[PDB]
Symmetry: C2
Subunit: 146 residues, 2 copies
Amino acid sequence: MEICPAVKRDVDLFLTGTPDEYVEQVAQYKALPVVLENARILKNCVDAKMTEEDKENALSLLDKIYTSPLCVKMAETCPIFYDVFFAVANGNELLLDLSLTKVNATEPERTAMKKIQDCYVENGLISRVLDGLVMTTISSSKDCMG
Amino acid sequence: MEICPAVKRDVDLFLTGTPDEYVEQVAQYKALPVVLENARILKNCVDAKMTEEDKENALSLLDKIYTSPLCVKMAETCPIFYDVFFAVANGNELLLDLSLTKVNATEPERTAMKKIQDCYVENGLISRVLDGLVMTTISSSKDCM
Ligand SMILES: [Ca+2]
Ligand SMILES: [Ca+2]
Ligand SMILES: [Ca+2]
Ligand SMILES: [Ca+2]
């Protein structure tokens, strides 16, 4: 089934919002100081590491995910998104690659997504409380559960 | 709001089921080989590390979570549960302790929950787990609407 719009919004802001716009949006779901602190580290990293072209390619890849049969035609909410998102957040390069292949990622798209994964990995955020909590919280919100 | 029953059931099975029963249930939500491999390692670790007494103390603590105003009276689904769960899954002992105090954990209850957290930390499993994937999948499922 299609992704919850609140989830798509969170990823869009993550990529295209200002740091404040993103972190404040996170704070609406989970206002733990550590979560907000980690969210800002991550967001500052993606802004610095990704060019405009990189962001454009991330967005086109995400559009491929949201429109994939492996997202839409499945019984539950957009399963391939969650596979990709959690591979990114926890630095699983193997599963990320496999999952990007399932949605016909271009090389520039793959490069863009790997930069986001690098921001989790290089800042030591794999074993930190962040997007497992935030993404679970958005996805299970009353907004999404309709 | 009260936790989704399917989430409560998953956690109960994690603690009290056989490894095969727990992994087969995880597979119904997310059948990725890495997820099932990790689920089994984690399950075998908790079964070996936790005494019957530890498991009882964990079940008692979860009950405190499920009945807490910080779970039930909130606008969204059992927020304190998710805080605890993700502090466990990521080996954040500070955040785990802060959350446990909120639900009036006893010392043996803290001890039991730390054993679960230790099983995530053990042998670098925290570096592997796709924490959030299974839990997001159960929590956002049609059954949880
Ligand atoms: Ca940039
Ligand atoms: Ca390029
Ligand atoms: Ca993690
Ligand atoms: Ca035992």
